[PDB]
Amino acid sequence: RYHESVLEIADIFDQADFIQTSDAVRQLRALMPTLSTSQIRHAIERIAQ
Amino acid sequence: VHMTINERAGMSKLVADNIIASVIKSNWVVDILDIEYTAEVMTPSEGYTQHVDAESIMTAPKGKLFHLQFMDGLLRPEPSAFDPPASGEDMRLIYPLQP
Amino acid sequence: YGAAVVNIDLNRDFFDTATGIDLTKGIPLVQDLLVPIGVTAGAEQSAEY
Amino acid sequence: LSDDFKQISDPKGYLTYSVKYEDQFTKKDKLRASEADDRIVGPTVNLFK
Amino acid sequence: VSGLLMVLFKVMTDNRLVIVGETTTPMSNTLSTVVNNVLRTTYHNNVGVN
């Protein structure tokens, strides 16, 4: 009977200075395949490229 | 039968063809959730540039992006009153699951 | 007059191939970021999106 | 101080499966799946064809 | 009998010490879930049979 859902940190924190992002990026990481550390290094090296 | 296929992998070519024939001969509705695709929306006057066998849809690799095309037949003018009647029937198989 | 459809796409002129981004299929697609290691990536991977 | 260890990379077992097929039902043709799932599952489905 | 002996000898003298070989790490989305539940990040290219 639970409803799983994302909750922005901003909706529970009044200190706006320490809240840089939102639900969007987690929603983005949901698309992302589980990443090996080697694959992460490959992403970083490629973006750098 | 509204058959849903979550994982095409492992499926025999025989069972795939048989399910397709079941869709035709027995009016099965086969949702296949495992395809990722990128629709292009064609105008009626540019036709369907790309043709696709059911066989390719059934044996597409799991990670590859398919590229389906779809008509918007809204801009298709009425037939002339004296165009000969069409005894045959235009058919269709593939459809989107979501808008 | 006679415009069959007016879609809103990512501006390909902005998101150039300088940024590694094809947009021709209607979505951004980058060639070598999230990739299997030890094997060639393959064509038209959905991960590219 | 000692050459204690030979250093193989992808080690062979002391045992293996070995298979006799009945040619009358065997299809000579190699089994194939999606390229990745064949890179793993593949040698196996050929042995227990 | 002697065959068994040599088998044992070749076992007693198996001083092999495995070093990680060629090892592919597939993007997960390409694998059917039945393989994903089995796969643990990265297999050796010489998969073997099971």
**Is the CB of E28 inside 8 Å of chain A's CB atoms?**
yes
Contact state of E34 with B7 under an 8 Å Cβ cutoff? yes
Tokens 């990722």 belong to B36
β strands within A1-49, DSSP E: none
From chain B, pick out residues whose CB is under 8 angstroms from the CB of D36.
Answer: 61-63
With CA atoms as reference, the chain A residue closest to C33 would be A43
Q: Which tokens in the block code for residue B33? A: 């959730």
CA A28, A29, A35, A37 torsion-angle sign? positive
- Residue B89 and residue D17: Cα distance in Å, rounded? 56
Chains that touch B (3 or more CB pairs under 8 A): C, D, E
Residue type for position D13: G
**Residue C22 main-chain phi, psi, to 5 deg:** -75, 145
Question: Would you mind telling me the total number of residues written for chain B in this entry?
Answer: 99
**Residue B29 main-chain phi, psi, to 5 deg:** -110, 115
- Approach to solving: cryo-EM
Q: Which tokens in the block code for residue B60? A: 């597409």
Question: Are the CB atoms for D16 and E25 separated by under 8 Å?
Answer: no
Q: Work out whether strand C21-22 and strand C29-30 pair parallel, antiparallel, or are unpaired.
A: antiparallel
Task: Tell me which residue of B52, B64, B62, B61 sits closest to B95, measured CA to CA.
Answer: B52
Residue type for position D27: K
Q: What is the DSSP letter of C38?
A: S
Question: Are the CB atoms for B76 and B44 separated by under 8 Å?
Answer: yes
Q: Which tokens in the block code for residue C17? A: 């191939």
Resolution reached, in Å?
A: 3.1
Residue E30: exposure state from Cβ atoms within 10 A (0-12, 13-18, ≥19) = buried
Tokens 């981004």 belong to C21
Tokens 């030979």 belong to D6
Residue C26: exposure state from Cβ atoms within 10 A (0-12, 13-18, ≥19) = middle
With CA atoms as reference, the chain C residue closest to D35 would be C42
Top residue of C32, C34, C39 to mutate, by most chain E CBs within 10 Å, is C39
Chains that touch C (3 or more CB pairs under 8 A): A, B, D, E
Question: Are the CB atoms for B73 and B44 separated by under 8 Å?
Answer: yes
Q: Work out whether strand B69-71 and strand C21-22 pair parallel, antiparallel, or are unpaired.
A: unpaired
Residue type for position D8: I
Top residue of B7, B55, B62 to mutate, by most chain D CBs within 10 Å, is B62
Rg (CA), chain E: 18
Task: Tell me which residue of B72, B76, B70 sits closest to B95, measured CA to CA.
Answer: B70
- Residue B41 and residue B18: Cα distance in Å, rounded? 30
- Residue D24 and residue B84: Cα distance in Å, rounded? 56
For E13, the 3-state DSSP assignment is: coil
